Amino acid sequence: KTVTVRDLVVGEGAPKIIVSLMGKTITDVKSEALAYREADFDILEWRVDHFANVTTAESVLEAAGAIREIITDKPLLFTFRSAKEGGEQALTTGQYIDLNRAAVDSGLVDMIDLELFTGDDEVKATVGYAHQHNVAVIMSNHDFHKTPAAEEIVQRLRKMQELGADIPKIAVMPQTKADVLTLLTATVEMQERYADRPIITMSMSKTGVISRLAGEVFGSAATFGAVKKASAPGQISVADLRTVLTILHQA
Amino acid sequence: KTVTVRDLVVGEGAPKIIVSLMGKTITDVKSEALAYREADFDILEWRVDHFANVTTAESVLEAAGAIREIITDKPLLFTFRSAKEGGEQALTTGQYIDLNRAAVDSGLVDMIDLELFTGDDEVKATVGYAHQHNVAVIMSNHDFHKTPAAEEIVQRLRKMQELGADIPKIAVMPQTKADVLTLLTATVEMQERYADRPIITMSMSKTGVISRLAGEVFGSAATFGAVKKASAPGQISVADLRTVLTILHQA
Ligand SMILES: O=C(O)[C@]1(O)C[C@@H](O)[C@@H](O)[C@H](O)C1
Ligand SMILES: O=C(O)[C@]1(O)C[C@@H](O)[C@@H](O)[C@H](O)C1
Ligand code: NI
Ligand code: NI
Ligand code: NI
Ligand code: NI
Ligand code: NI
Ligand code: NI
What we know:
The structure is a homodimer.
Chain A: E1 3-5, E2 8-10, E3 16-21, H1 26-36, E4 43-47, H2 57-70, E5 76-79, H3 93-106, E6 111-115, H4 120-132, E7 136-143, H5 150-162, E8 167-172, H6 177-194, E9 200-203, H7 210-213, H8 215-218, E10 222-224, H9 238-250
Parallel strand pairs in A: 3-4, 3-10, 4-5, 5-6, 6-7, 7-8, 8-9
Antiparallel strand pairs in A: 1-2
Helix pairs in contact in A: 1-2, 3-4, 5-6
Bound molecules: (1S,3R,4S,5R)-1,3,4,5-tetrahydroxycyclohexanecarboxylic acid (QIC) (2 copies) and nickel (II) ion (6 copies).
One nickel (II) ion binds next to loops of chain B.
């Protein structure tokens, strides 16, 4: 039903706020962590794919340690988003799995993101590896250009559950207003008929913004907001996001 | 596809906020108007079915006059919601039509609400009469038991346009979460396929609250908020409503 990471219970109450941190170097990461330190969010996602030379595990881990030193009371989600799913760089399957297992081993991260389309064998063994070390797994899938049919969105979320994800996650891009409703339809069907754990769903862009606010009623356990003044289309600031989620929760 | 009521342009920018004033006597009506001066909304709906002496035209017009003396800078919408459609009192078709014609004649109201299923002939004649006096017509339909199929909702909104409504309006009750999406789908399809003027849609109760907040993206031009108490299930406090509409508008 719920997933507890530290003191945070995902799948209960108002949806949780995730913010993404991007830095190319340890200095960039430190600067961002310091700017994020006082902001009101629940989970810090480190977008590792923006970091240079990720194949040097030690550099990555030094940066993870730096984040933990600065942001000490928020769960840390380690996410290498591959270029094929909108990320900044690509790694071989072996390198990607090695990177994630190194994060797990470090004891510095509370959760890792694993992409559904990495491959069943590798994904499932790494979920097992993360669990042995008390690290939670968000399994993810993204389509930055379009919205698949509701039935296919549900299928992907169900597959993530079958592969052992603690929290299935899907983000899709609407081309029309109807696509936003398609994503919400999939969220409702999944949460009502198949889900046995928290799920995260979102429809990107300004058009899909309602998907970031309607999680409590339709079934999304978390959403993403921005800390920076200058954000992107559909990225509500964390203070405003907290304001709206609280209004809906207390209504 | 816009309607101008005083300086307010409905169908443009963020959705407009309507609040309902409910008072039994002229004394209650004046007291509520005073309180409502301290709320932030765009259109004042007077729910005439809450008024006790509705069959005495002179009392009704005195009450309307009192509202106008207190709330001078907001368009006034005259609405007798029939018991049949979720209101507080029932009237014969003739009494209902004459009440609205009396409101039109007074020169005190900017808009009247006419229920779609009152009867085609009566509705068409009353719309013509309103227009002769430069009074706008919100044509309405309510289902407090269920959410008809999306196509039926669309056909009712289309019919309202055919009968000459300035702003078609429909409120339905969800029995499930998917029903909320059905209402939003009908809003989009009406907007895409047939709307040549603003429309107002809402899924009632707490379950449908998101429908009252997402009008800018899906096509609803106005939304109802509560000042002290709700005039229908699902309305949230007017200050919180404006806050959410603004955050979404800037997203
Ligand atoms: O990383 C994702 O899954 C995001 O959905 C990508 C993009 O949509 C951002 O605007 C979101 O804040 C987060
Ligand atoms: O907000 C609603 O659901 C309403 O039912 C909408 C409209 O019918 C108004 O006349 C009511 O006072 C409230
Ligand atoms: Ni609470
Ligand atoms: Ni170990
Ligand atoms: Ni396990
Ligand atoms: Ni593509
Ligand atoms: Ni604006
Ligand atoms: Ni006249």
